[PDB]
Design a protein around this motif. Structure first.
Motif: not given
Lengths: 370, 20, 370, 370
Positions: A69-76, A150-163, A179-181, A265-269
Motif C-alpha cells: 500500500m503506497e499513498h493509500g493506494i494498494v498496488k499488490d 479542520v483535520v490535518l493528518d499525516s500518515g505514512d502515505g497521505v497528507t490531507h485536510a478535511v474542513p 508526500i508523507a512519512g 511541486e506540491s503545496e505542503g502541509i
C-alpha cells in the motif's frame, strides 16, 4: 446477525485492528509482507515463508520487506488479502470473518477501483455479513468529541485536510498530497547516503524509519539552521555501530513543508491546511481556523506544531486566533473514532449489507459512503 | 586510435526500427 | 529399501564412521593410506601392502604415509576409494554397501568436480541405493539442538565460518580459508628444524602432529611472549630421545590467526568469524555474535577460545554480548548431527536416490545438496 | 594564472590523466598502490617501497596490492595522496601542481565529507591555483557533443544513470547502485573456486579481471543457456597453466542485471535505466528513451547492449523508439568531455579558486558544483 463489529484502520505504514467499544486498539502491527532472502538448508526453520506482524519485526534481517500500500493506494492485492487474513487469524483476533461486520478506513480522493476491489475482497473471499468504508478525518473528530474542525493528518502515505463544520464535510474544500512519512523516510535515507551511511536493502530500510521516529526535529527558522553549523548527534543502530547523523536529522522532515526538495511541486502541509480553509465558505473560515485537529504519525516530529502555527501566522489573515489542537493518542485517533462510530446505534443504517451488495453491486457502496 | 582497449564491430548504437 | 543408514564424516586429518541413531561414532581412524617402504624378505609378514586404520597407526615406521585429501579436496581418488572400501569392509563396519543409504560430508565452497566424482564412486563402484552430501556447519547445529548461530570450525583441512540464523544458511556470507591443522603441523615441523630437531619422513611427520596436539598453547598477547624468554619445556618422543621445544610450541598455532607467517595473505580464523557476521544483514548480526559455535580439532589449543574472544572484542562493535559456545565432544560434533539428521523421517526426501542419479546425473546432485 | 589545466578522471578501477584540449588521455593506469610482500635481501632491488602505474603492473607478484577507492569513495586517503603525487611527478606528467588548474571527477550522490577532504588535499598538500569537481554524465555528453541524454555508465566501482535534457541535469531522477565491474570480477573469482581453480592474493586478483575483460559474454536468454550445456572454453595464465572457465563466463556478468546473485537486493543496470527515465517528468520521457548513452568498462561485455535493449523493451511502454547509443571511445568518454569542458572559456567562471577556498571553505565548493 448483529455481533460486535471489527474496526480495521488501514494505512500504508501501520494497520490497527480490534473490536468496537474498546478504549485503545489492542492489535497494532506494521502493514508489510516479509518473505525470506536466504535459503533454508536446515530443518526446523521458520515455516510458512510469508511473515506479517511481530514475527516480521523480530526477523527483519531474513525477510525482504515490501509494502502493498503506497499513498493509500494498494498496488499488490494478494499481499493485502494475506494481511487481512492474518488480522482475523488465531495469532491476533481469534475470530471468524463470518460473524462480525467490518468497519474499514480509506484516505479521501483515492481510486474508486480500489474501493470496489476492497469490497469484493471483504464480501466474497472473506464472507462478511456487512461492510462499511469511512473517512479518516470524520473518525478523528469522533475520537476528540468535536463536531467542527479542520483535520490535518499525516500518515505514512497521505497528507490531507478535511474542513468539517458541525457535521458537514465539504468534499470540494478537501486538499491532498502524496508526500508523507514514507517519503520523509525515503528522503532521510537519501540524505544519509550524502552523509556517508547507506541503507540500500529493504530490511535495512526499517532502520531509517527508526532513526526518523527517534532522532529528528523540525526547526522553526530553516535559513538560520542552514547558516549555523550542526553539532552532529549520535545514534546506535540495532547492530551496535555508532552513526553521527549530522544536518540530515533536521533537513529530512522539512520535506513536509517544502516538497520541492524531493522534486515534486506540491503545496505542503501548511499550505494544504490554509488552502482547505480558504476554499471553504467565508463565514466558516474563522471557526475552521480556531478548530484544527492534528492526526497521524508525521505530526509527532519535535517542534512540528510550533512550525505549523508560524506558517499559518505567515499565510492567514492578520489578527485571527489560530489553534492547532493535538490529542495524546494521535496515531490511534482514527481507530478510536471508528470504535465510537461502531458502538453507536446509527451504525446499522450506514453500512452495506451482503444481500444489498449481491443485488446492486459497487453502485450501492458508492452511494452509501457519500 | 592509440591506447590499449577498444571494441571492433559493436557499432555506435542499437536502435529499434521506426514505424509510421 | 530403507535400512539403518550409514554416516561417513569425511575429513583430511581424521575420518569418522558408524550408523544412524548412535550416541558416539564407534569407528574413528585417520584418513591416510600407508604403504611399506622396506622390502619383505622373510615370510609370515604383514599381507596386502595397503594399510588403513589401526594397523597403519601401529606400524608407522614401515609405511610411507600419504594423505589423499588436502583442504577437503581429495587429490588421490584411488586412495579415497580404498579408504571407503576399508570402512565398509569386515575390519570396521561388517556390512554391504548395497543395503544402507549413505550420509557423506564435505566442506563448503569446494570444487564441484570432486562432488560429482564422489557421487560416481558411491553410485557405481559401490552400489549405493541413496546418497546425500551435507555441510559441517548445519550438522554441528543439529548436534547441539540449536538453529541459530555461527559455526566456526577448524579441522586438519579447512577453516570456515558459516552464519546460520533460524534455519537459514546464507551462502554469500560463507567465509573459508585453507589454513587449518595440517598447515599448523607443517609450520611446527619447519620451526623444529630452526630449533634443531629436524623431521623429514612421512611416518616421522605424525610425531609433529602428536607434539602439536600435546605441547602447544595460544598466548593472549603475542608481543609480550616475544619479548619474554621461554623456559624450553621438554617432550619425550616415541623412541625415547628428549626434545626441548622452546618457542616453537606457542608460535606454531599462531598461524591460524596470522596467515602471513607461512607466506599467504589470507584472513585468519578471527577475521573469518567477524567477516561472516558482517556479511550478513544488519538485524541478524547481534544474534550471530551471541551464538558462536566452535568445532574441529584445531580449536582445542590452550588459550584459543580466550584469544578468539579478545580478537572479536577488538574487531566487532563495542558493547555487544559475545559468547563463543562449544560442545564437550568437539571432534565428534559433525558426526552426531549427521546421525541425528539421518535418523529423521525427512532424510528420505533430502537424499539423491540411485534411480534419480541414473536418470538425470550430476544435475540432480547439484539440485539436492545445495 | 591561467595555464593549460589538468584533467584527473578519478575512479576505483582506472585513473586517467593529462592536459586539456587533447583527443585521448596520454596517461592511463590502474588506480591502486602496490607495496612489497617479501623481504629484499639482495641489493640493487626495486627501490621506493611504493609502486604505482606500469611498475606495479609489471611487478604484480611481489606487491600486496590494495585499492584505495571502493564505489567511488576513497577509504585510504594516504594512498590517494600518493597516487595523485605520482600522477603529477616526473614518471608521468613532468609538471608542478602549482602551475595548472585541476579538473577532478566523482560519481554522483557520494559522501560530501570525501568531496571536502578531496578539496583539502588539492588545496593544502598540493598547492593548486583552482579546482573544479564535475559529474560523469555531464562529461560523457560533452564528449559526444549532445545536450539531451540518459548516461547509463558502468565503471569498476559504481553504476548509475543521470537523465540530462538540453543542459538540465535532474538531481532527484538519479538512480545509483554500488554493483559494478569490481563486484563482477569478485563474483567471477568465487565461481572459479567453485569450478576448481582458486585465486586469493591481491596480485592474483588481477588475473580474474583479465579473464573477465577477455572471455565473458552476456546471454540474451539466461534460462535457455542454463538448460543447455556449455562448451567450456580455455584461457592461458601468465604461468601457462590452462583454465577451463565453463558456465562461469556467462553467469558472471549476470550480477549486473540480477543483483540477487551476490546476495544484495538492488535494482540492476536495466532497471536503473528505466527508473531514471520514469522518475523524470512526463514530457521528457520519450526524448530520454531516444537518447540513451553508454560509458564505462562494464558496458564492453559481448551482447551487453543487445540484452540492455531487450530489458528496456520488456519494461518500457510499447511502441516507443529505443536507442542505446555507445561511442567507439567509451572508456575515455568522461576524460574527453572534461578536456573539452576545460578548453572552453566558461571553465574560468565555474571553478573554485584557492583564494575563494581560503575565505569561505567547504561551503563555496558545495555551492559551485550545484
Amino acid at each position: 446477525i448483529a455481533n460486535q463489529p471489527v474496526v480495521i484502520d488501514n494505512g500504508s505504514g501501520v494497520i490497527k485492528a480490534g473490536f468496537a467499544g474498546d478504549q485503545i486498539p489492542k492489535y497494532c502491527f506494521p502493514n508489510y509482507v516479509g518473505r525470506p532472502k536466504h535459503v533454508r538448508v536446515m530443518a526446523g526453520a521458520l515455516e510458512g515463508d510469508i511473515f506479517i506482524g511481530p514475527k516480521a519485526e523480530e526477523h527483519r534481517g531474513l525477510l525482504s520487506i515490501r509494502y502493498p500500500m503506497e499513498h493509500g493506494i494498494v498496488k499488490d492485492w494478494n499481499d493485502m488479502e494475506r494481511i487481512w487474513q492474518y488480522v482475523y487469524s488465531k495469532e491476533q483476533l481469534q475470530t471468524f470473518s463470518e460473524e462480525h461486520p467490518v468497519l474499514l478506513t480509506e484516505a479521501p480522493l483515492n481510486p474508486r477501483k480500489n474501493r470496489e476491489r476492497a469490497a469484493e475482497v471483504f464480501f466474497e473471499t472473506f464472507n462478511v455479513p456487512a461492510l462499511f468504508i469511512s473517512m479518516q478525518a470524520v473518525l478523528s473528530l469522533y475520537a476528540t468529541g468535536r463536531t467542527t474542525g479542520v483535520v490535518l493528518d499525516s500518515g505514512d502515505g497521505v497528507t490531507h485536510a478535511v474542513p468539517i463544520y458541525e457535521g458537514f464535510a465539504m468534499p470540494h474544500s478537501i486538499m491532498r498530497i502524496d508526500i508523507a512519512g514514507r517519503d520523509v523516510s525515503r528522503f532521510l535515507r537519501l540524505y544519509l547516503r550524502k552523509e556517508g551511511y547507506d541503507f540500500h536493502s529493504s530490511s535495512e530500510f526499517e532502520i531509517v524509519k527508526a532513526i526518523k521516529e527517534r532522532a529528528c526535529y523540525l526547526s522553526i527558522n530553516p535559513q538560520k539552521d542552514e547558516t549555523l553549523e550542526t553539532e552532529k548527534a549520535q545514534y546506535y543502530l540495532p547492530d551496535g555501530s555508532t552513526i553521527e547523523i549530522g544536518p540530515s536529522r533536521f533537513r529530512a522532515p522539512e520535506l513536509l513543508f517544502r516538497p520541492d526538495l524531493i522534486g515534486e511541486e506540491s503545496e505542503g502541509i501548511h499550505e494544504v491546511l490554509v488552502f482547505a480553509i480558504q476554499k471553504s465558505d467565508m463565514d466558516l473560515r474563522r471557526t475552521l481556523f480556531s478548530n484544527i485537529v492534528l492526526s497521524g504519525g508525521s505530526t509527532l516530529f519535535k517542534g512540528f506544531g510550533d512550525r505549523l502555527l508560524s506558517e499559518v501566522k505567515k499565510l492567514a489573515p492578520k489578527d485571527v486566533k489560530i489553534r492547532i489542537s493535538a490529542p495524546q493518542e494521535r496515531l490511534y485517533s482514527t481507530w478510536i473514532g471508528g470504535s465510537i462510530l461502531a458502538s453507536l446505534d446509527t451504525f446499522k443504517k450506514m453500512w452495506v449489507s451482503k444481500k444489498e451488495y449481491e443485488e446492486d453491486g459497487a453502485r450501492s457502496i458508492h452511494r452509501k459512503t457519500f | 586510435m592509440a591506447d590499449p582497449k577498444y571494441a571492433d564491430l559493436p557499432g555506435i548504437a542499437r536502435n529499434e526500427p521506426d514505424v509510421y
